[PDB]
Design a protein around this ligand. Structure first.
Ligand SMILES: Nc1nc2c(ncn2[C@@H]2O[C@H](COP(=O)(O)OP(=O)(O)OP(=O)(O)O)[C@@H](O)[C@H]2O)c(=O)[nH]1
Ligand SMILES: Nc1nc2c(ncn2[C@@H]2O[C@H](COP(=O)(O)OP(=O)(O)OP(=O)(O)O)[C@@H](O)[C@H]2O)c(=O)[nH]1
Ligand SMILES: Nc1nc2c(ncn2[C@@H]2O[C@H](COP(=O)(O)OP(=O)(O)O)[C@@H](O)[C@H]2O)c(=O)[nH]1
Ligand SMILES: Nc1nc2c(ncn2[C@@H]2O[C@H](COP(=O)(O)OP(=O)(O)O)[C@@H](O)[C@H]2O)c(=O)[nH]1
Ligand SMILES: [Mg+2]
Ligand SMILES: [Mg+2]
Ligand SMILES: [Mg+2]
Lengths: 78, 430, 427, 427, 430
């Protein structure tokens, strides 16, 4: 009838781990923060990827005028 | 059923035991009157309904300190006749405490021990708290140690003796009484856990950040060690280490049985909010020389065998990771013939905090109780005081009158000289 | 219809079997109340292997609990799946051995050995046909080590026609847990090599590294270790409890794993160990269980199997699998690395197939291997004893309780014979 | 049923494969959660070249991401399409090679090589037919070049009959990113000749230029640069993943593009690179994919191919195309400019057509060119190495981890030897 | 997890450290009490629940610069044992900080560095902040740096030291105290970043249009340079630069390891609106000698190795074009044997602005730390200042009487004379 003392209360539960009943996430905390909006969406249409060039998607009518007016991705020089 | 009885002789013995049962009554939640509103079975006797009495005896030849226990805050908790008084003190003389006036009072102490052991089912060990520097603790303590050895034979006994420090000490005949006590401890006491006052003064100065430490502050955190070294019986954990384990694992030789002490997390209220107290950090603090309770350098000696008890939420693996980091450090050393040198004990109940105490609530605690060959140095300095002093036959007229003989200082001198021969020989490699 | 007598000794084996009977009861499907509620009729077919019937649907396991301190008995009783145990099998003392081999064997063990041999013979007589004697204890302590090797010495004298698996956790070389471990280790194995027919030696450092490097578990407890040894221990007798395409019992293990009577030392492992978040990336197929089977990290022993040639091997496969596919990595691990196996034994590997997998897993396997890497496990204990007995330290706790130093020299006589013969066949 | 195992090192290697496995994934139609939701049956036919099938439809790549810092995998932990990887295949360090080729190779290199090769060996035995091993790393760095080039030498020892694709980026001639840039490059090419079987040469300054004059982008990030590199790496093994009228695997390019075993440094190119402004006006037919194939501006290497002769060239066409228009356009470039091709080899051009184009593009083609103009790149790095070594500057670091100047003199000796045989063949 | 330990020694060290850790707590959102309402592991040590402890110590023999930290707005931040004081200062004497009073406190200095190093999991380097003018920063820094190479071998040690300006200095024995410091920071410190008070006086004068700069304003942008130096660990970017990456790129020879410092954008709150801050503008601004943080003219010497650490919205292409425009300029001349002088690092975190500070919020910032042969002008001038004062034995009896001898002036002078020979020999064109 020894006095109960609290367990270390780890999240381990190796029985549950080896049975795979609870998935969880084994990965630790992500280091080196998480910078918001870097690299920035470019001006003169918002380009965060090269998917348009590498997928050959057709130009939208609301964005065709920008390339009608300008040559490079620098915006509205004239 | 685990059960340990403790005896308290000498002015050090009662005043340490005042704080010992102050923490003991707090772990089990019992109010100081003696009512709990079965880990209490190993320290308290369940008496009828709602009444509990501690299974310890207080005894002192001086009638002073017993009365302030009898008229203090623990008048109802203790048993009124377990408190043992005396007509007068032994007065810093080992002769008076062992022969003349302790003899009329040792037999009233012996029967109440028999009353305590008959009440319990299974006893585990003997705890003695005393000081060899005075008359009452060294005299009646040795006088009781003769009687309990022949009556309750071969039972494990663990002793806590407050030895003189090399620097701070409060009696002139103090080196006489320590030498005469050591002739009784070596052949009778199984494992003697050493203590020293100014090391605990030093651990209050730099750790607890109090610049005015007193005897109350020292004895308050001595009780933390005593509860920690008996924490396996009370509360459950990973590796239970009882008193029977402690002797048979830690004493290698019959005449080599002395012991150090440590208690690493000793942190005030303001200091606790900034310390990251992990198992790895608290292990490193215990083995450092600044945190021990006797001023001896373990670098000067070599460790013989070590035992560690962990309290609180300690997972059983970083204790083994800390041991590997301990043994790979060169600044700590072991004797060459002892490859396996650590005993691990884990308990899950964290140490309680006394109200008004300077110790803060810490979730992890370790006590390092280790044999060492550096205990020769604290015996060489104390013997160096005796040899320079006995050359002039000083202070002997107090001793030879009360039953002692003049030659008895010589056998006690060579007994300590034989001990110094043992400590230097066993620390030598081959 | 064959049954196993389980012995638990000391504070280790009581806690080992507390988690071991947790798995076996859950694999057989009985609740903490004791009634059966599993959904498989095949699950209830072989219950006499590990449990006995009782009036009212209760099932009481056939095992004993044995120690010298009642504190550890409070741990197994109050823990989960502890109410199923037989109260009559709770044989215990009051003194406590105190990490001494002399106490549990000669002086204060004698008043409890006669009590438990009366208890042990009760289920020995009540059961119909004995198959073996499983024990689970340690060798570094004194409560289960010194007392356990006397009981295993006493039980073979009465019953000399049965096999006996032993699951003894040996002291680790890297970490010290008790100062007098090389005393109790050498004296316990001194009794076993004359007596123990086979032995599964384990340690604490291998279960740590398994649960760090493979399970990727941050701060685990011993309950995590005691489950993994239970995963092995249930996997040893998987062919007895469940039917299969090729069944192999304890004697099938023995006949294929000990070429010589004195070379009976093995090493164990549990194959399908995956991390907490890596179970969705694995492919539960027989090529990769064998990949985890023969890895040095996956074993539950301090020995490195790449250092010593395997004298023989075993396989306890459970689940639905192709026996051709089972046979083809087991042939592949003979041929891809034949330099790490013995030469004068063809068909070094034994295999078995059980048709029922463990709970929560589709497939599992258990490896048992007699190797000359246990040579390295005894060399550390032999180095510890020889470098320390020369100064006759710690003997007053031993020589004062019944045995002489001549027994310690006899422990040097045969342990140096064990290390001689294992290296001899390596050449 | 041939396989490619992908291994990557350093800052540069891991960021490419974050985009490379991204580009491969949506070609095969599998989500970042790993499930397949593609609309084409031809995608699932050859998945095993790059992915392990798992329980529940999960697909995990043969990706072994190696680094000595946790920073790179942290980007892989949180980047898009970074959850598809096997968590066990993230071998990691803690110290970091610190942009030192000596630290990644010799002293601190040895502590992780025995662990990273264990992950490689587990994946190598799981798949049946190994076409080869593909690595993507840097050369001027120290973590992916120092540890990577030792890893290439080790894996050629264990698997000597399997090819080796290396996609190693090169120190730029115009600009520089690190200070020990020529030191770590010459020590790696000295090893890359002996172990690796074929090399694709990349550099950021050509990737920067190809994003300006061909794509009309004035703000190219690295993720923009990694996409054009990832299009090349998909084009090499487009024959394995998809059918075609004429099939050319990895080993067919090796016998084509490598006349002698030390001439395995090639230059790459991707054909349908159209800016969004001029996207509508260009047509997609084989003659205008060829005219952007052989342009010196389209080459992703420092070397101008107009300076040196083309010893052997390869083309990896993708799409529904006429076989004549593939044949006649690559025949016209052998007659219009035959001074840029080697006279003593007839028909320097290897051509192959796969009927499955990439996503969205009607047609695509990838160019691999074994030009002798690559000696201009190797001369400049050897020019910088001799300038800094003769003063022995930045050498007290490399000699600190256990190097002497013997292999530094050997590295310049082999660098001068390999550039000497390029100019001997140009005459 | 990566971690770097910063030791703050001398009067300059704490006053930088108050500005340094103020910039650090605003980046991670930690309030001054220590509570954040995953990247703090570089500098902060997580303890308890919601408490972050700076991984730094304040070591100074003069208690009146440390006590204002102990009573200011950062009381709850620091661990009270990290703040190490002394009875009395070294009083700008190298002999007091190294021999007499230095040895009495450096034992307690290692006691907490070991505590900080044990709490660290993965260590990459050390930061040291000192001023060679005053004997606490000069002598005790020399004692601590010599001991740390013995205690923690082969680890990085970042030297952020402040040197006397040519025309400006606020002490008399500064030529004496700087030269003796150069015997230790040569052979022990692996990376040393010179700072100079008058150059930052000029930087605050024109760029920040402050007519009356103070010690608070100078140390605030000292904090900007160090935070930009180690922002690569805390945040993610295109090209990370680690501590050991920083050390092998800029130290060609083991003694040629002194480097410059330049932070390019210093703009006011009212000039920020009118400046078009691009990566081409700031990169040309950094190489300007007006933005140079040490009073030396780089046109006399040769640039030898440079690193450019970019913070904020810096895209990787035009920064690679910005370096090319620097190389084409004939004014910025590099040494002949190094055709690859530039190291580049880009982080995506824009620099934080302290509330009530003087710097303006900018979206782009670059910090250049460059090794040059123009730093010989710093040493040779301080060599001339020492040689003139030593020639008539001025202020020697103060230095000699506190433990030293005359022979340590000749060895330190000869050691510094080798540096001027080494700088000329390395930078010579062949
Ligand atoms: N740590 C600690 N030591 C104590 C305490 N009380 C007394 N001592 C020690 O005891 C020594 C004196 O020896 P004692 O045997 O206790 O004196 P005594 O019990 O009064 O015996 P007599 O002097 O003969 O009457 C002193 O030097 C103290 O160091 C205490 O409360 N705590
Ligand atoms: N930039 C900067 N320099 C400072 C600051 N405080 C002191 N200094 C420099 O330090 C020099 C004085 O030497 P110190 O090292 O500070 O003297 P100390 O640290 O008090 O040493 P002791 O007097 O022996 O205690 C002056 O010349 C200043 O240039 C500061 O807050 N910022
Ligand atoms: N794996 C495991 N090992 C244990 C457990 N309990 C004790 N041990 C091991 O047993 C050793 C101590 O011996 P002990 O169990 O006390 O032996 P006893 O005295 O005969 O009971 C230590 O090295 C522990 O590692 C447990 O629950 N699990
Ligand atoms: N394409 C590309 N190249 C990169 C990237 N990051 C770094 N590099 C190149 O890598 C070279 C430096 O090597 P480094 O990254 O230090 O190699 P490591 O030490 O192994 O990590 C430089 O020349 C860069 O151009 C990236 O994200 N994409
Ligand atoms: Mg008294
Ligand atoms: Mg073919
Ligand atoms: Mg001062």
């Amino acid at each position: 009838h020894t006095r109960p003392a609290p367990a270390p209360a780890s999240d381990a539960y190796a029985a549950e781990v080896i049975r795979g009943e609870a998935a969880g996430d084994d990965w630790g905390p992500r280091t080196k923060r998480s910078v918001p909006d870097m690299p920035k969406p470019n001006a003169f249409d918002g380009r965060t990827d090269l998917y348009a060039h590498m997928q050959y998607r057709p130009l939208s009518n609301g964005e065709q005028g920008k390339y009608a007016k300008a040559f490079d991705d620098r915006g509205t020089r004239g | 059923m685990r059960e340990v009885i403790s005896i308290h002789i000498g002015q050090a013995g009662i005043q340490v035991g005042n704080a010992c049962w102050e923490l003991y009554c707090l772990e089990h939640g019992i109010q100081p009157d003696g009512q709990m509103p079965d880990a209490f079975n190993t320290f308290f006797s369940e008496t009828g309904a709602g009444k509990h009495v501690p299974r310890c005896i207080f005894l002192d030849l001086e009638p002073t300190v017993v009365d302030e226990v009898r008229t203090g805050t623990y008048r109802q908790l203790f048993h009124p006749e377990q408190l043992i008084s005396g007509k007068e003190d032994a007065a810093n003389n080992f002769a008076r405490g062992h022969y003349t006036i302790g003899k009329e009072i040792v037999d009233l102490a012996l029967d109440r021990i028999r009353k305590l052991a008959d009440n319990c089912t299974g006893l585990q060990g003997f705890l003695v708290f005393n000081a060899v520097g005075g008359g009452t603790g060294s005299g009646l303590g040795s006088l009781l140690l003769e009687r309990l050895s022949v009556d309750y034979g071969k039972k494990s006994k663990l002793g806590f003796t407050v030895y003189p420090s090399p620097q701070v000490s409060t009696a002139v005949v103090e080196p006489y009484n320590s030498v005469l006590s050591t002739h009784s401890l070596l052949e009778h006491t199984d494992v003697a856990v050493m203590l020293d006052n100014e090391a605990i003064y030093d651990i209050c100065r730099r750790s607890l950040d109090i610049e005015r430490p007193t005897y109350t502050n020292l004895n308050r955190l001595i009780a933390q060690v005593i509860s920690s070294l008996t924490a396996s019986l009370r509360f459950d954990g990973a590796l239970n280490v009882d008193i029977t384990e402690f002797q048979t694992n830690l004493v290698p030789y019959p005449r080599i049985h002395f012991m150090l002490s440590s208690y690493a997390p000793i942190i005030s209220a303001e200091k606790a909010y900034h310390e990251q107290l992990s198992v790895a950090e608290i292990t490193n603090a215990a083995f450092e020389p600044a945190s021990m309770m006797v001023k001896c350098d373990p670098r000067h000696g070599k460790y013989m065998a070590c035992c560690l008890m962990y309290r609180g939420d300690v997972v059983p693996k970083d204790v083994n990771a800390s041991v590997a980091t301990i043994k790979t450090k060169r600044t700590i050393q072991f004797v060459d013939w002892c490859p396996t040198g650590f005993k691990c004990g884990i308990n899950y109940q964290p140490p309680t905090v006394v109200p008004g105490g300077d110790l803060a609530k810490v979730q992890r605690a370790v006590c390092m109780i280790s044999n060492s060959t550096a205990i020769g140095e604290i015996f060489s300095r104390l013997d160096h005081k005796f040899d320079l002093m006995y050359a002039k036959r000083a202070f002997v007229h107090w001793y030879v009158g009360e039953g002692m003989e003049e030659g008895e200082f010589s056998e006690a001198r060579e007994d300590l000289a034989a001990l110094e021969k043992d400590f230097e020989e066993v620390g030598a490699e081959s | 219809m064959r049954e196993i007598v389980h012995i638990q000794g000391g504070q280790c084996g009581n806690q080992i079997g507390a988690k071991f009977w947790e798995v076996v009861s859950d694999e057989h499907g009985i609740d903490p109340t004791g009634t059966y509620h599993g959904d498989s009729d095949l699950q209830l077919e072989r219950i006499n292997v590990y449990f006995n019937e009782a009036t009212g649907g209760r099932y009481v396991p056939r095992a004993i609990l044995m120690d010298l301190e009642p504190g550890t008995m409070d741990s197994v009783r109050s823990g989960p799946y502890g109410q199923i145990f037989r109260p009559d099998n709770f044989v215990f003392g009051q003194t406590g051995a105190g990490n001494n081999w002399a106490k549990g064997h000669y002086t204060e063990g004698a008043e409890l050995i006669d009590s438990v041999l009366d208890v042990v013979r009760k289920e020995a007589e009540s059961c119909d046909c004995l198959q073996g004697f499983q024990v689970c204890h340690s060798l570094g302590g004194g409560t289960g080590s010194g007392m356990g090797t006397l009981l295993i010495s006493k039980i073979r004298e009465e019953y000399p026609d049965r096999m006996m698996l032993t699951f003894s956790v040996v002291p680790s070389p890297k970490v010290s847990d008790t100062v007098v471990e090389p005393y109790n280790a050498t004296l316990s194995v001194h009794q076993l090599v004359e007596n123990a027919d086979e032995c599964m030696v384990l340690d604490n450092e291998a279960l740590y590294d398994i649960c760090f490097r493979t399970l990727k578990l941050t701060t685990p407890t011993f309950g995590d270790l005691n489950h993994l040894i239970s995963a092995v221990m249930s996997g040893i007798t998987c062919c007895l409890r469940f039917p299969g395409q090729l069944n192999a019992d304890l004697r099938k293990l023995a006949v294929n794993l000990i070429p010589f009577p004195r070379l009976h030392f093995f090493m164990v492992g549990f194959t399908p160990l995956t991390s907490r978040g890596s179970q969705q990336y694995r492919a539960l197929t027989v090529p990769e269980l064998t990949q985890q089977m023969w890895d040095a990290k996956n074993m539950m022993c301090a020995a490195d199997p790449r250092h010593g040639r395997y004298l023989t091997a075993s396989a306890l496969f459970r689940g639905r699998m192709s026996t051709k596919e089972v046979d083809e990595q087991m042939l592949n691990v003979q041929n891809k690395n034949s330099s790490y196996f013995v030469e004068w034994i063809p068909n070094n590997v034994k295999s078995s197939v059980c048709d029922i997998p463990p709970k929560g897993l589709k497939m599992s396997a258990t490896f048992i291997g007699n190797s000359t890497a246990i040579q390295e496990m005894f060399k550390r204990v032999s180095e510890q004893f020889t470098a320390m007995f020369r100064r006759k330290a710690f003997l007053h706790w031993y020589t004062g309780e019944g045995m002489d130093e001549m027994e310690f020299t006899e422990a040097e006589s045969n342990m140096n014979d064990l290390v001689s013969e294992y290296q001899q066949y390596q050449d």
